[PDB]
Amino acid sequence: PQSKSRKIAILGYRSVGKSSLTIQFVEGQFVDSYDPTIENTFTKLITVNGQEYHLQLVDTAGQDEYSIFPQTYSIDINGYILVYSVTSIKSFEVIKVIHGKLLDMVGKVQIPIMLVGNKKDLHMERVISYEEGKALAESWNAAFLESSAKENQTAVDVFRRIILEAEKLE
Ligand SMILES: Nc1nc2c(ncn2[C@@H]2O[C@H](COP(=O)(O)OP(=O)(O)O)[C@@H](O)[C@H]2O)c(=O)[nH]1
Ligand SMILES: Cc1cc2nc(CO)[nH]c2cc1C
Ligand SMILES: [Mg+2]
């Protein structure tokens, strides 16, 4: 087809950089601040392996270990990006809980789930190694990338990759 519309939900604990990553990709800017309590859907046209997509990104407000994941929430979602911050242990423990709840929601439907460790630019504050995030992702059979919302190419790589994974499963 000439174009495919795909919707990806961006999940994770408060403050890990879900809005900033999404805005870096969509607008090519690192925003000073963006309301942490707001959920918006952003869109961007991207081409992956010659195929054009209208990618819709649902920048969720945030989840924690008491968040819920009714099957209702999964309607029209084609893939999930689970974000933690490499500077926050809490955020990494939370993404593990979110993933298990997510799996319960989506069951065995063929939709991609990838893991993203964000804020990789904060070297002095890092508390999670690359390898710890990669091993988690492997245990999930999930793609893994680290990012910085201050680095446009790392934002682009994240959203290109979730579309590549979606295509492999379709
Ligand atoms: N240094 C750095 N700060 C980041 C990065 N991503 C987000 N931030 C900052 O982290 C805070 C939370 O970011 P936000 O995008 O609002 O997180 P959200 O709650 O997941 O949407 C804000 O002060 C952002 O400026 C990143 O990759 N590097
Ligand atoms: C697509 C989606 C959006 C959500 N928003 C919240 C509350 O921030 N939880 C969510 C779960 C899903 C799957
Ligand atoms: Mg936000």
Author numbering: 2 to 171
Question: What's written in the study?
Answer:
Growth factor signaling into mTORC1 is regulated by the heterotrimeric TSC complex, which acts as a GTPase-activating protein (GAP) for Ras homolog enriched in brain (Rheb), a GTP-binding protein that is broadly expressed in human and mammalian tissues. Rheb is a monomeric protein with a molecular weight of about 21 kDa. As in the closely related small GTPase Ras, the flexible switch I region of Rheb undergoes a conformational change during nucleotide hydrolysis and exchange, while the switch II region remains largely unchanged.
In particular, 1 showed significant chemical shift perturbations (>0.03 ppm) of 25 residues, with the most significant being Thr-61, Gly-63, Gln-64, Asp-65, Ser-75, Ile-76, Ile-78, and Val-107, all of which are present in or near the switch II domain. Further confirmation of the binding site of 1 was obtained through X-ray crystallography. 1 was then soaked into the same crystals, whereupon additional electron density was observed in the switch II domain. In addition, the primary alcohol interacts with the backbone N–H of Ala-62 via a bridging water molecule. Our observations were in line with those of Maurer et al., who reported small molecule inhibitors that bind in a similar region of KRas. However, due to their weak binding affinity, we did not expect 1 or its close analogs to have functional activity.
